Amino acid sequence: GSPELRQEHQQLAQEFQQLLQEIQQLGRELLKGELQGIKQLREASEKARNPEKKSVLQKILEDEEKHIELHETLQQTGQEAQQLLQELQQTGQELWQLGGSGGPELRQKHQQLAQKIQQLLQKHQQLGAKILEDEEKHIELLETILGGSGGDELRELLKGELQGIKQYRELQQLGQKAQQLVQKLQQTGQKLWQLG
Ligand code: HEM
């Protein structure tokens, strides 16, 4: 009903804010792991003597350099998402305050902001998914080329990679929840002034 629907919309948007925060923090923990993983890869790579193991390591390392970069895009789409969320909150409150006395430019802004934030989430999701498939390949390669020697650190590189995958899977799950919240904010939002 109309007050209850207003509150649901409001509560979805609070839930969404908290989730965006969780996504950003997880993204920073992921970049910390990437940097620490690069150090461990270089350590394995220096000690490697077999040419093929050396090469496999250096090609993982290239991927990881790319993932550092892609973390810049992850971070930014998330940041921009939080910016648009701020603007959703602000335009939202102004809509309730002013109604249709706040002219049509206000209602269009809020709709347009909703449209754009869903695209940023899709962009963010696609970037995360691409990193994750890489890390799944890294594990296969590491399990394949490395042995039980001290210098290989099969355990240390694998452990780090495995912790990373667990976190990137979580990241994608939080993103899918976010996209689902946005859908529901649209579904409730469209109803809010239908018996206003
Ligand atoms: C992530 C946060 C939010 C999203 C994605 C979002 C999205 C939407 C969407 C898609 C609509 C339907 C727009 C249309 O009629 O074409 C809507 C309506 C509305 N939203 Fe939000 N909203 C959010 C947060 C808020 C907040 C915090 C308020 C605060 C009061 C608010 C107030 C409104 C109002 C009053 C309407 C009905 C009038 C209108 O259609 O413009 N919204 N919202």
Author numbering: 1 to 196
The authors write:
The RC maquette uses histidine (His) residues in the hydrophobic core to coordinate the central metals of tetrapyrroles for site-specific cofactor binding.
Even the orientation of the maquette heme relative to the superhelical bundle axis is conspicuously similar, suggesting that the particular conformation of heme in the natural proteins is not precisely controlled for any functional purpose, but rather follows directly from structural constraints demanded by this protein fold. At neutral pH, Zn(II) and Cd(II) suppress Tyr oxidation. While the introduction of a hydrogen bond from Tyr to a His residue appears to have little impact on the lifetime or yield of charge separation by itself, the addition of Asp31 adjacent to the His71-Tyr168 hydrogen bond raises the yield from 2 ± 1% to 11.5 ± 0.7% and shortens the lifetime of charge separation from 40 ± 20 ms to 3 ± 1 ms at pH 9.5. Light-induced electron transfer is clear as near-stoichiometric Fe(II) prolongs the lifetime of charge separation from 2.0 ms to 250 ms at pH 7.5 in RC maquette variant L71H (orange and Supplementary Figs. 8b and 10a).
